[PDB]
């Protein structure tokens, strides 16, 4: 679920899920068009076509379980929705930690008319 994902986010980086990335560049929450503006956004891209791979499923209010076993996220056993959704948000806050070493907050709050380029998943 949202509420999670957003734990999640917080756990691996340290940064609230919102506003540091519930807005962020061309991908990130609401929206998903044009170029990716740099690594953190291209996680977004990732998520968001993740998400897309599972037309049946709703991530923003399905709850799944998780835990740690080395300071590692393991996905445990739900649904398979669960288990998918769980998986797409797992690969995403990794990918937020991966790369917090070129986020930036200039990219806040992005303009939508400034994401253009067509890319498919
Ligand atoms: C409670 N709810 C309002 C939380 C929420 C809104 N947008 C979020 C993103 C967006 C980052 C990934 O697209 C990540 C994690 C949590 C949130």
Known sequence: ????????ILEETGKLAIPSY???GCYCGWGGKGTPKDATDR????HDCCYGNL???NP???????????????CEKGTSCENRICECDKAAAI???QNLN??????????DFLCKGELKC
Do not use: H
């Open 43 to 46: 996680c977004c891209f990732v």
């Open 60 to 74: 923003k209010s399905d709850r799944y379980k998780y835990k740690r076993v080395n300071g590692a996220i393991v």
């Open 102 to 111: 070129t986020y930036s907050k200039k990219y806040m709050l992005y303009p």
């Open 1 to 8: 679920s949202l509420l999670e994902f957003g734990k999640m």
């Open 55 to 57: 037309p049946d499923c």
């Open 22 to 24: 519930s807005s962020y």
């Open 95 to 97: 990918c937020f930690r």
